[PDB]
Amino acid sequence: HWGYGKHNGPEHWHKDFPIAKGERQSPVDIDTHTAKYDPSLKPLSVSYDQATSLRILNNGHAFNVEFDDSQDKAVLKGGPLDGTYRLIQFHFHWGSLDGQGSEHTVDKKKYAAELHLVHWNTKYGDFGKAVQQPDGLAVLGIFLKVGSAKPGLQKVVDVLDSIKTKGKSADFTNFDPRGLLPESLDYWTYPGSLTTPPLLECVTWIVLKEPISVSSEQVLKFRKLNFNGEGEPEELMVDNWRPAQPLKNRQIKASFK
Ligand SMILES: NS(=O)(=O)c1cc(C(=O)NCCO)c(S(=O)(=O)c2ccccc2)cc1Cl
Ligand SMILES: [Zn+2]
State yes or no: 119 annotated in a binding site: no
Give phi and psi for 161, each to the nearest 5: -45, -35
Interval between CA 198 and ligand 1 midpoint (Å): 8
Residue type, 8: N
Neighbour count for residue 163 (Cβ, 10 Å) = 20
Give the C-alpha distances (Å, rounded to integers) separating 200 from 136, 164, 217.
10, 28, 34
Give phi and psi for 160, each to the nearest 5: -60, -35
Do 103 and 245 meet the contact criterion of CB atoms below 8 Å apart?
Answer: no
Name, in order, each residue with C-beta under 8 angstroms of 43's C-beta and a sequence gap of 6 or more. 78, 79, 185, 255
Pick the ligand that lies closest to the CA of residue 196. 1
Do 190 and 35 meet the contact criterion of CB atoms below 8 Å apart?
Answer: no
Burial class, 171, CB count within 10 angstroms (exposed 0-12 / middle 13-18 / buried 19+):
exposed
Instruction: Please give the Cα distance from 177 to 135 (Å, whole number).
Output: 23
Name, in order, each residue with C-beta under 8 angstroms of 67's C-beta and a sequence gap of 6 or more. 51, 52, 53, 54, 73, 74, 87, 88, 89
Do 170 and 159 meet the contact criterion of CB atoms below 8 Å apart?
Answer: yes
Best substitution site from 169, 196, 245 to test ligand 1's pocket, by max atoms within 8 Å of Cβ?
196
Interval between CA 88 and ligand 1 midpoint (Å): 11
Instruction: Please give the Cα distance from 138 to 257 (Å, whole number).
Output: 23
Measured by CA distance, the residue closest to atom 4 of ligand 1 is 116
Instruction: Please give the Cα distance from 17 to 41 (Å, whole number).
Output: 33
Give the C-alpha distances (Å, rounded to integers) separating 93 from 110, 146, 164, 172.
12, 14, 16, 20
DSSP output for 78-98: ETT-SS-EEEEEEEEEE-SST
Q: 132-151 burial, b if ≥16 CB within 10 A, otherwise e?
A: eeebbbbbbbbbbbbeeebe
- DSSP-assigned letter for residue 68: -
Pick the ligand that lies closest to the CA of residue 85. 1
Strand (E) or helix (H) holding 159: helix 154-159
Q: Which residues are catalytic?
A: 61
3-state SS class at 15: helix
State yes or no: 12 annotated in a binding site: no
Do 112 and 102 meet the contact criterion of CB atoms below 8 Å apart?
Answer: yes
DSSP output for 88-136: EEEEEEE-SSTT---SSEETTBPPSEEEEEEEEEGGGSSHHHHTTSTTS
Instruction: Please give the Cα distance from 137 to 257 (Å, whole number).
Output: 26
Best substitution site from 115, 194, 206 to test ligand 1's pocket, by max atoms within 8 Å of Cβ?
194
194 lines ligand 1 (CB under 6 A): yes
Partners of residue 145 on adjacent β-strands? 213
Do 72 and 86 meet the contact criterion of CB atoms below 8 Å apart?
Answer: yes
Instruction: Please give the Cα distance from 217 to 223 (Å, whole number).
Output: 10
Q: 84-112 burial, b if ≥16 CB within 10 A, otherwise e?
A: bbbbbbbbbbbbeebebbbbbbbeeebbb
Strand (E) or helix (H) holding 140: strand 137-146
Instruction: Please give the Cα distance from 212 to 219 (Å, whole number).
Output: 12
- DSSP-assigned letter for residue 158: H
Instruction: Please give the Cα distance from 99 to 116 (Å, whole number).
Output: 19
